[PDB]
Amino acid sequence: ENFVGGCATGFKRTADGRCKPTF
């Protein structure tokens, strides 16, 4: 129960961080 959800619509995952507002 951790890979079923992540970032929001306006939130994108960073190739070096996490789920933040558009990269």
Method: NMR
Q: Measure the CA–CA gap between 1 and 5, rounded to whole angstroms.
A: 8
Q: How far is CA 3 from the centre of its chain?
A: 11
Cross-strand bridge partners of residue 20: 12
Q: 5-23 b/e with 16+ CB inside 10 Å = b?
A: eeeeeeeeeeeeeeeeeee
Q: How far is CA 13 from CA 2, 20, in A?
A: 15, 6
